């Protein structure tokens, strides 16, 4: 019944005292934190508190949609000596600091990823040319499926691969995805290995990187330029914005203190110093 948009317990009035009751004194060893209300260390009046935590709720903290990655792709002239560029990004929030620190406050999470795409595009070369409104294909290639070889190959036939055909210049594309986790919460922090080493085997044959779980959890995104090699080479960028909608979090871990380094919690030297200076006796 106590929803997020209620109204903090109104401040009760309170006069002098001289009781053997000792609210003020704690003892942090117990790990428990004294739930002392303002009403204890001072005489308080009867304030009718209207303010509510309706905005700090776990749902609202992650109410904005963060940018998980950018993806460069380009359609060059047929006569191009180089193969046509089709970017392929492996679904995993861990690419940019922002959304990665928010999620990282919690040990485990169960959310419904609601991916949106703001696709842009300019003419590379100095050459003064034209290009009929391009259309892009954003194929979701599920963990284990065959990742696209050439730009135009069979893999793109997409008989069973959830794909979106975005026409340039239009309301930015959006596809909601339900908890696609193998477990019961995406583990923001995995302690342990994906293969245990066994004595009756070579040090290699059975090794593995710490913290890594599934080879392809979330999946991979194949994005091509669907049209054919056009005289005027046009490069494009597909910025994907992931916004965790129906979300839940567990175990409140302390926020990242020093600059992120790689997919693993590991940290580079130098960046190791986070705090700022201040005299132990200056306001």
């Amino acid at each position: 019944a106590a929803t997020s948009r209620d109204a903090l317990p109104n401040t009760e009035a309170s006069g002098p005292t001289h009781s053997k009751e000792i609210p003020a004194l704690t003892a942090v060893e117990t790990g428990a934190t004294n739930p002392l209300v303002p009403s204890d260390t001072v005489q308080t009046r009867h304030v009718v508190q209207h303010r509510s935590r309706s905005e700090s709720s776990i749902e609202s903290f992650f109410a904005r949609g963060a940018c998980v990655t950018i993806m460069t792709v380009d359609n060059p002239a047929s006569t191009t000596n180089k193969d046509k560029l089709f970017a392929v990004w492996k679904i995993t929030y861990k690419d940019t600091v922002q959304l990665r620190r928010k999620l990282e406050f919690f040990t485990y999470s169960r959310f419904d990823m609601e991916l949106t795409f703001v696709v842009t595009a300019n003419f590379t070369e100095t050459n003064n040319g034209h290009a009929l409104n391009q259309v892009y294909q954003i194929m979701y290639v599920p963990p284990g499926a065959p990742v696209p070889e050439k730009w135009d190959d069979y893999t793109w036939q997409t008989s069973s691969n959830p794909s979106i055909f975005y026409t340039y210049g239009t309301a930015p594309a959006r596809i909601s995805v339900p908890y696609v986790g193998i477990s019961n919460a995406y583990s923001h922090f995995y302690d342990g290995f994906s293969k245990v080493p066994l004595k009756d085997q070579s040090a290699a044959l059975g090794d593995s990187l710490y913290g890594a779980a599934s080879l392809n959890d979330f999946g991979i995104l194949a994005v091509r330029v669907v049209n054919d090699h056009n005289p005027t080479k046009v490069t494009s960028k597909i910025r994907v914005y992931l916004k965790p909608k129906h979300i839940r979090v567990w175990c409140p871990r302390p926020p990242r203190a020093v600059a992120y380094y790689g997919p693993g919690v590991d940290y580079k030297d130098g960046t190791l110093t986070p705090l700022s200076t201040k005299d132990l006796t200056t306001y």
Partner: protein, 68 residues
């Protein structure tokens, strides 16, 4: 199969109803068969911070002495 709910208006003038009295509602309609496609209903709850603040193999009375 309308999902009509009450907004939490800050009793604003001529918003429909406030310090002249009245309430404010908004219609919602889940359109897709797949739940993970519904609009985040924002009608979320709030538990007591006790499982983190006050977690002990006993009970703690504030007016009492901590380390008994």
């Amino acid at each position: 199969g309308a999902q009509v709910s009450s907004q939490k208006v800050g009793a604003h003038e001529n918003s429909n109803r406030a310090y002249g009295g009245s309430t404010i509602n908004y219609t919602t309609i889940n359109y897709y068969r797949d739940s993970a496609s519904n609009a985040a209903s924002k009608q979320d709850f709030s538990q007591d911070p006790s499982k983190f603040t006050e977690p002990i193999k006993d009970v703690l009375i504030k007016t009492a002495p901590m380390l008994n």
